[PDB]
C-alpha cells in the first residue's frame, strides 16, 4: 500500500482489481475537468435479478481521502477473496458498486497531510458536492448530476458514504425542518433500520466501538454507541444521504472514518485494518429485512410512512430490523437476524 492513487492511477488500480478477480469498470460521467467518475461493479451491463444493489461512494470531499483508499482496497480484497467463502457468498448474492472518488478534482487539489484541523473539499466550481442535492426541507456540479442520474437509473437499496474529519456513523436526515445547526434530532420513517446499519458498521471498527473519536476539534463528542443522526450532529442543507432516502429508496449512511482527512500514505494500511471488516459487514448487512418479487409496484410496511418501489423485475428488498410486519402492495411477516425473509406476491 503506502501510496495514494492519482489521475490514471485510480483507473489502473481499479483495472488491476478487476484483473485480480466478475468485475466491470465503467464511468457514470465526468467531473468538471473531465476526470471520469470510475465505478466498479462486483457480482455497465444488464441488471441481474435477485441481486440487492449496494453502492459505496467515497471521497465526496476532495480532502477526505481515506475513503478513496479504503474503497480501492475493498474492491481489491473482494476480487481476491472471490478468486481465492464470506467474500465469495457476498459477491454471489449481492451486486456491489464501488465508487472510490466522486470528486477527483478536489482530490487532486488536496494537499499532503493537512488532516483538516483552499483544501479541495469543493469541486472545481467551488460548489460542495454534499450541499448540491435536493432537500425535502445543477449544471455546476457535473459529478452530483451524474450520480443523480446513476441513482435514478438503478434501484440501490443500501449505500454507504465514507468521509473524513470525524470518526462516526451518521444515519439519514442530516438536515432538519427548522434548520438549526445542532441539537435537533431529525427522525426518519426508517430510523430503526438506519440505526441498525450504523451500529453494525461502527461495532466492527476499532475506534467507533467507542463514540468518542479522540481527535482535535471536539474532544468531547461522545456519540452514543458510535453512531449519530446527521441533523443531531450538525445540520447539512441538501445532503446526499437524505436525498437518497427521499428521492430514492436507498438506505444511505455517512461514515466518517478518521479525523485526519488526508493522512500520510503510511497510515493507509492501518486505516485499512480499521475498515476491512467494517465495510464488508455493511455490505453483508443488505441481506436483512424482507426480499421478494411481485414491475414498478409500490411496496409498503404498516406503521412506517415510507413506501418503496419494486425493480425492473419486481424485486423488492425492504430492509428491516427483526420483527413482525404487515406488508402491503399497491399497483404478519416475520423478520429474523440473518437472511431476508422471502415473501412473494
Amino acid at each position: 500500500f503506502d501510496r495514494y492513487y492519482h489521475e490514471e492511477e485510480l483507473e489502473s488500480a481499479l483495472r488491476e482489481a478487476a484483473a485480480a478477480g466478475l468485475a466491470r469498470l465503467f464511468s457514470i460521467g465526468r467531473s468538471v475537468e473531465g476526470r471520469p467518475l470510475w465505478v466498479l461493479r462486483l457480482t455497465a451491463g444488464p441488471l441481474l435479478p435477485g441481486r440487492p444493489q449496494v453502492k459505496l461512494v467515497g471521497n465526496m470531499h476532495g480532502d477526505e481521502t481515506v475513503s478513496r483508499q479504503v474503497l480501492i482496497y475493498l474492491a481489491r480484497e473482494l476480487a481476491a477473496g472471490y478468486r481465492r467463502p464470506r467474500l465469495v457468498r457476498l459477491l454471489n448474492t449481492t451486486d456491489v458498486y464501488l465508487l472510490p472518488s466522486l470528486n477527483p478534482d478536489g482530490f487532486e487539489r488536496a494537499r499532503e497531510g493537512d488532516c483538516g484541523f483552499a483544501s479541495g473539499r469543493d469541486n472545481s466550481r467551488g460548489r460542495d458536492l454534499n450541499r448540491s442535492f435536493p432537500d425535502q426541507f445543477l449544471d455546476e456540479v457535473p459529478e452530483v448530476r451524474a450520480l443523480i442520474e446513476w441513482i435514478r437509473r438503478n434501484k440501490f437499496v443500501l449505500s454507504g458514504n465514507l468521509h473524513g474529519g470525524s470518526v462516526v456513523a451518521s444515519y439519514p436526515f442530516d438536515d432538519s425542518p427548522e434548520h438549526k445547526a445542532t441539537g435537533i434530532y431529525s427522525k426518519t420513517s426508517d430510523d430503526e433500520v438506519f440505526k441498525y446499519l450504523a451500529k453494525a458498521y461502527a461495532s466492527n471498527h476499532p475506534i467507533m466501538k467507542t463514540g468518542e473519536p479522540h481527535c482535535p476539534g471536539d474532544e468531547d463528542e461522545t456519540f452514543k454507541d458510535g453512531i449519530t443522526n446527521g441533523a443531531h450532529w450538525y445540520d447539512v442543507e441538501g445532503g446526499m444521504q437524505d436525498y437518497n432516502y427521499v428521492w430514492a429508496n436507498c438506505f444511505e449512511i455517512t461514515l466518517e472514518l478518521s479525523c485526519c482527512k488526508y493522512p500520510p500514505a503510511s497510515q493507509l494500511r492501518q486505516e485499512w485494518e480499521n475498515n476491512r471488516e467494517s465495510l464488508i459487514t455493511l455490505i453483508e448487512k443488505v441481506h436483512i429485512g424482507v426480499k421478494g418479487f411481485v414491475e414498478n409496484a409500490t411496496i409498503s410496511v404498516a406503521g412506517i410512512n415510507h413506501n418503496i418501489t419494486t425493480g425492473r423485475f419486481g424485486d423488492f428488498y425492504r430492509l428491516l430490523v427483526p420483527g413482525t410486519y404487515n406488508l402491503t402492495v399497491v399497483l404478519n411477516v416475520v423478520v429474523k437476524e440473518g437472511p431476508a425473509t422471502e415473501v412473494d406476491f
Binding site: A118, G126, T182, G183, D220
Partner: protein, 410 residues
C-alpha cells in the same frame, strides 16, 4: 454629495452623504419592563455607528496601522440641534435609524421619543452646523503583547520572598524567592481590572443546561441586564465556544429576525484581546480569605488600587460615543458598549444629509520584529464578496470587524 475619506498625516476626514426620507403621545406600559414617556412627532438624525462614516476598507486602513483614534470635529449639512443639551439624549443607546453603512441605501429618519418631565420640542429655536469634540482619550485600538501576570524577567529571581511552606515535609514557616519557575508566586505591581461575573453560555448548544436561563441566570443589576456590563474578556485560552450570557455585543446579520434570531443569524463579538488585563467575564476575579483556612471565590470585584483594565473594543457596526450622564460623580466615564464618553456629545439633530468627522490617529511606533496580526479578507473564492452587495442588491456586513489588531506592551 461628498461621501469621501481623506487621510492626511495623523488626521482622517471621513465624510458620508445619505439620502433620507409621525404621530406628542403619552406612551407607557413584568415589573422590569415598565416605562413612561412621550412619543414626539419629531424625527432625529443619528450617525452614532462607525460604519456610517468608515468604509470597510477605511476601517481596515484604520485598525491595521493605528494604535488609537478619536474624533476631533464634525460638520453636518442638510430642524434644530440642542446645542445646550436640554432634551433627553436618546442617542448612544445603540438604537436603529442611523445612517446606512452603504452610501447608496436610502433610510428613513427614526421617530424621536423620550422617557421620564414633558418636553415640547416646538419650545426650541428651529441647514448646517459644526461641532467640536472635547478632548477624549484615544480608543485603545491595540492588543497587549504581554499579560498582566507575565511582566517580569523570566531569567532573574526576585529579591522579595513569598511564604511558600507552612508545614514540614509539623507546621512551620518557609519562604522562597519568586523566580522563573514560580511565576504565579512572584510579587507583582498591578491587579486585573474589576470583574462583574457573568454566566457562561456555549455556542455548542449541547453543552448548555436544559433550561431557559437567558434571564433568570442573567447578570442583571438592580432588574435590568448588565448588557454588556463592564469590559471583560469574553473567554480564556482555547475557549472560543464560550461567551458571557449578556456580556458581549451581539450584532445582527442581514435579514436576521428581530426576535428568536438563531445563532447562525447573529454575529458574536469576542473581547478576548483584553484577556491580558481584564479577567474573563465568565470566570471569577480571584480567591480571598474567609477565616482550617477558608477561601471565598470573589465574583463581583470593584475597583482596587493598582488595577489596570482595557475598555471594550469598538466595532465598525458598534456605537461611536455615548453621553456621560450629568451626575455628581462617576468612575471611568466610558461607555460599556464601547466608544467615547462625552460630557457634551454631538447634539442630536431633531433630502440628503452629509456628515464629516475628523479623527485624530495615533501612529504606531512598534519595534516588534515579527509581523503583526492584520485584518484581511479571505483569499479563497466565495459566492459573494464580503462587505459588498449581493445579487438582489442588499449590502451586508458578514462579520463584526474588531478594532484591536496591532499589539503593544503593557
Amino acid at each position: 454629495w461628498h461621501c469621501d475619506s481623506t487621510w492626511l498625516g495623523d488626521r482622517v476626514i471621513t465624510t458620508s452623504t445619505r439620502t433620507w426620507a409621525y404621530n406628542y403621545k403619552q406612551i407607557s406600559n413584568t415589573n422590569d419592563n415598565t416605562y413612561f414617556g412621550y412619543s414626539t412627532p419629531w424625527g432625529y438624525f443619528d450617525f452614532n455607528r462607525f460604519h456610517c462614516h468608515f468604509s470597510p476598507r477605511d476601517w481596515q486602513r484604520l485598525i491595521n496601522n493605528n494604535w488609537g483614534f478619536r474624533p476631533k470635529r464634525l460638520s453636518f449639512k442638510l430642524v434644530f440641534t440642542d446645542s445646550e443639551y436640554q432634551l433627553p439624549y436618546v442617542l448612544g443607546s445603540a438604537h436603529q435609524g442611523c445612517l446606512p453603512p452603504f452610501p447608496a441605501d436610502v433610510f428613513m429618519i427614526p421617530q424621536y421619543g423620550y422617557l421620564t418631565s414633558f418636553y415640547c420640542l416646538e419650545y426650541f429655536p428651529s441647514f448646517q452646523f459644526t461641532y467640536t469634540f472635547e478632548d477624549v482619550p484615544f480608543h485603545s485600538s491595540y492588543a497587549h503583547s504581554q499579560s498582566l501576570d507575565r511582566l517580569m524577567n523570566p531569567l532573574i529571581d526576585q529579591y522579595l520572598y513569598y511564604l511558600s511552606r507552612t508545614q514540614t515535609t509539623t507546621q512551620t514557616l518557609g519562604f522562597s524567592q519568586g523566580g522563573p519557575n514560580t511565576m504565579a508566586n512572584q510579587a507583582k505591581n498591578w491587579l486585573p481590572g474589576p470583574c462583574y461575573r457573568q454566566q457562561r453560555v456555549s455556542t455548542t448548544t449541547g453543552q448548555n443546561n436544559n433550561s431557559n436561563f437567558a434571564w433568570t441566570a442573567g447578570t442583571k443589576y438592580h432588574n435590568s441586564l448588565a448588557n454588556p456590563g463592564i469590559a471583560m474578556a469574553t473567554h480564556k485560552d482555547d475557549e472560543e465556544r464560550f461567551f458571557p450570557s449578556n456580556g458581549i455585543l451581539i450584532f445582527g446579520k442581514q435579514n436576521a429576525a428581530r426576535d428568536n434570531a438563531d445563532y447562525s443569524d447573529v454575529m458574536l463579538t469576542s473581547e478576548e484581546e483584553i484577556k491580558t488585563t481584564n479577567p474573563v467575564a465568565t470566570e471569577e476575579y480571584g480567591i480571598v480569605a474567609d477565616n482550617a483556612p477558608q477561601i471565598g471565590t470573589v465574583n463581583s470585584q470593584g475597583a482596587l488600587p493598582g488595577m489596570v483594565w482595557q475598555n471594550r473594543d469598538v466595532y465598525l457596526q458598534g456605537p461611536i460615543w455615548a453621553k456621560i450622564p450629568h451626575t455628581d460623580g462617576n468612575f471611568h466615564p466610558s461607555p460599556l458598549m464601547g466608544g467615547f464618553g462625552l460630557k457634551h456629545p454631538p447634539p442630536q439633530i431633531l433630502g440628503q444629509v452629509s456628515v464629516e468627522i475628523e479623527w485624530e490617529l495615533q501612529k504606531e511606533n512598534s519595534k516588534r520584529w515579527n509581523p503583526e496580526i492584520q485584518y484581511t479578507s479571505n483569499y479563497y473564492k466565495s459566492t459573494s464578496v464580503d462587505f459588498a452587495v449581493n445579487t438582489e442588491g442588499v449590502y451586508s456586513e458578514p462579520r463584526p470587524i474588531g478594532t484591536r489588531y496591532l499589539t503593544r506592551n503593557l
